[PDB]
């Protein structure tokens, strides 16, 4: 039995988007104010204050569940797994740093100077 509006949930955990590369990066908040980045935000077009390997985040979002965001306090250093965007991988907006195209590139991580 279960209460009103309850869910008799099956004993099985959910599996997220598999067969997609993962990139672990150490992100440290240099600024004196807190920063929180959402699931689908493009980390390459984030604040300049955050010190990390910027070049490794080409067309790559957070490797966490959709919707949710992870908070960074001033100074605190946190490791974050990153996953590449799906479909055509054509991003626009954020800070006018790239606005479209994809990097990718089989064998060399080249193109798009900044």
């Amino acid at each position: 039995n279960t209460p009103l509006g309850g869910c008799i949930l099956a004993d099985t955990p959910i599996t997220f988007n598999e067969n997609k590369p993962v990139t672990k990066v150490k992100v440290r908040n240099t600024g004196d104010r807190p920063i929180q980045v959402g699931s689908h935000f493009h980390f390459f077009e984030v604040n300049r204050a955050l010190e990390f390997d910027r070049a490794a985040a080409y067309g790559k979002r957070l490797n966490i569940s959709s919707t949710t965001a992870i908070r960074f306090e001033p100074g605190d250093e946190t490791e974050v797994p990153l996953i590449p965007f799906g479909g055509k991988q054509t991003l626009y907006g954020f800070n006018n740093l790239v606005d479209g195209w994809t990097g990718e590139g089989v064998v060399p991580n080249s193109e798009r100077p900044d």
């Binding site: 509006g5 959910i14 699931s39």
Partner: protein
């Protein structure tokens, strides 16, 4: 990464294999399919997937696909292929697509007819249930407030007739003659529901029926008070053939012109809508249910009898004296009711709904019927028939989808098929109109959160307008922007015959409402009705009024406590 379904259900709602309890009933509905790739779930909020360059996109609305509104992952309850979890899209007041939403340029597996952009405004689809709005084929136009009570329970479509509180209207769903029809088509301009006017189907000539068809009637009405003769039906059916409309009947309960078998001969196997197939509302007493055995018939039912209660026998002996102005002192008036109050057919009606014989469900509002208890009394019967008759051979071994899908079809898709408006409204399918209802599974079938009509919210649950949120008390239902100004007329549909549409009723009668012509009323049969295609053999005893279906006595014991009533309502 991996995460448990408990935290997923608390944010993104259920998925494949999860069962949802429908309020305080014993019915549980399992998700048959999830049309989404796990990982890219689309939801709106502070720092969520639906932002610039993530869920949205820089392309224009003209690029057929950019939605005007999206329901962020909801559990659909449709009769065609329901009990599924998917993002539903709205565009031009119609259902664009059903599957996965977002930006295909940066998300994998996005459905082509379902993309979020600059034109979309999201709805919190999670932890809720979506469905097609209800239709009521038996509506006496006695009061215009009736619609507010109907729309307050998930019924955004009306079908019937009347002028106002005239004794003529109080007993019969008719708007007789072109003058009355035009005045009612014009009064409906100030109503927040779809309407289908029914004319008087009592004539020997072809002309008086033709005048009403060209005036703008979706069908005809044959009542016992106006004379349900073999000629009144033959001529109403003859005209309904050449006009492509549906005739509704309330047969002669006095057995004056003939018996039930003589009126079936007068039908000549032509499709017809039968009101109150049980017999409380009307029809050839005692064996009316016998009509539900033939295929041409489209059986509907009034809702004061469903569910079959212990105290139902007492109330209907006094109720019958007001609707058809019968005197309690005249012997011919009271002795006539003694047969019509037969309790054996009311219990049979309830099991016939479970078997899939009574194909649809109406009300007969303010004349032996309640308009604001339709979806409720459907789910109340579903709880009683599961607790008594048990799970069906067609029903799944671990869920009650088959019964719910069969029962929601009686108020959503089947009445729309009967009155020739399937292509417009009836089911949550692609290309159809956006006449949808949203409710919490806790308040399913009784109290919805919102009521979307033509892609705009017409009616919804609302708190104090001066407050800082829409949830603070007193939370009573009020008309929304979809029921204000010119948008009420735009989002509502005045149904008529093709003859009337071709003649130019919209211009002649000056209707700012949307005008769609009814069609495919005559060729349809009981096999075309969803989840209720059975035509079983019938045997009815005329003395004690016992009903035997295929050599088996059809009955059930009454219930004292029904599901969802004093626990949610006040009065």
């Amino acid at each position: 990464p991996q995460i448990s379904r408990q935290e997923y259900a608390g944010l993104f709602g259920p998925t494949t294999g999860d069962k949802i309890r429908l309020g305080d009933t014993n019915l549980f509905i399992e998700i048959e399919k999830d049309l989404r790739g796990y990982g890219e779930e689309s939801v709106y909020g502070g720092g969520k997937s639906l932002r610039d360059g993530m869920g949205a996109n820089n392309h224009l609305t003209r690029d057929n696909g950019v939605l005007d509104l999206v329901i962020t992952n909801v559990t659909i309850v449709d009769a065609r292929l329901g009990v599924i979890k998917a993002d539903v899209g709205i565009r031009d007041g119609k259902i664009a697509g059903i599957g996965k939403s977002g930006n295909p340029g940066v998300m994998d597996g996005v459905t082509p007819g379902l993309v979020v952009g600059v034109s979309t405004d999201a709805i919190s689809g999670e932890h809720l249930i979506l469905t097609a709005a209800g239709i009521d084929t038996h509506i006496h136009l006695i009061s215009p407030q009736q619609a507010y009570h109907a729309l307050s329970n998930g019924v955004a479509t009306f079908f019937g007739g009347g002028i106002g509180p005239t004794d003529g209207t109080n007993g019969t769903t008719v708007t007789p003659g072109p003058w009355n029809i035009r005045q009612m088509l014009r009064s409906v301009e100030g109503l927040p529901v779809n309407v289908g006017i029914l004319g008087k189907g009592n004539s020997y000539g072809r002309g008086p029926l033709l005048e009403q068809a060209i005036a703008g009637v979706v069908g005809y009405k044959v009542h016992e008070d106006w004379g349900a003769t073999a000629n009144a039906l033959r001529h109403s059916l003859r005209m309904a053939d050449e006009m492509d409309i549906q005739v509704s009947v309330h047969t002669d309960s006095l057995n004056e012109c003939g018996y039930v078998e003589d009126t079936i001969d007068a039908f000549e196997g032509r499709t017809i809508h039968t009101f109150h197939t049980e017999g409380a509302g009307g029809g050839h007493a005692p064996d009316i249910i016998r009509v539900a055995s033939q295929p041409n018939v489209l059986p509907s039912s009034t809702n004061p009898t469903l569910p079959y209660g212990v105290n139902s026998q007492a109330e209907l002996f006094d109720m019958i004296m007001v609707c058809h102005n019968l005197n309690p002192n005249v012997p011919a008036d009271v002795s006539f009711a003694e047969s019509r109050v037969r309790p054996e057919t009311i219990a049979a009606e309830n099991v016939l709904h479970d078997m899939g014989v009574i194909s649809m469900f109406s009300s007969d509002s303010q004349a032996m019927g309640r308009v604001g208890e339709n979806w409720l009394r459907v789910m109340q019967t579903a709880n009683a028939m599961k607790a008594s008759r048990g799970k069906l051979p067609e029903d799944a071994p671990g869920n009650d989808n088959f019964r719910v899908l069969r029962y929601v079809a009686k108020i959503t898709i089947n009445p729309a098929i009967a009155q020739g408006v399937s292509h417009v409204i009836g089911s949550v399918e692609v290309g159809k109109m956006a006449d949808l209802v949203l409710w919490d599974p806790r308040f399913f079938g009784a109290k919805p959160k919102m009521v979307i009509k033509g892609g705009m919210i017409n009616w919804a649950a609302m708190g104090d307008p001066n407050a800082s949120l829409p949830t603070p008390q007193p939370v009573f239902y009020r008309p929304m922007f979809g029921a204000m100004g010119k948008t009420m007329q735009d989002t509502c549909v005045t149904f008529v015959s093709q003859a009337a549409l071709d003649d130019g009723v919209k211009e002649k009668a000056g209707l700012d409402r949307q005008v769609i012509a009814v069609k495919n009323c005559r060729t349809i049969s009981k096999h075309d009705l969803v989840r209720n295609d059975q035509t079983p053999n019938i045997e009815v005893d005329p003395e004690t009024f016992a009903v035997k279906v295929d050599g088996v006595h059809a009955t059930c014991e009454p219930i004292d406590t029904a599901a969802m009533n004093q626990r949610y309502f006040f009065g």
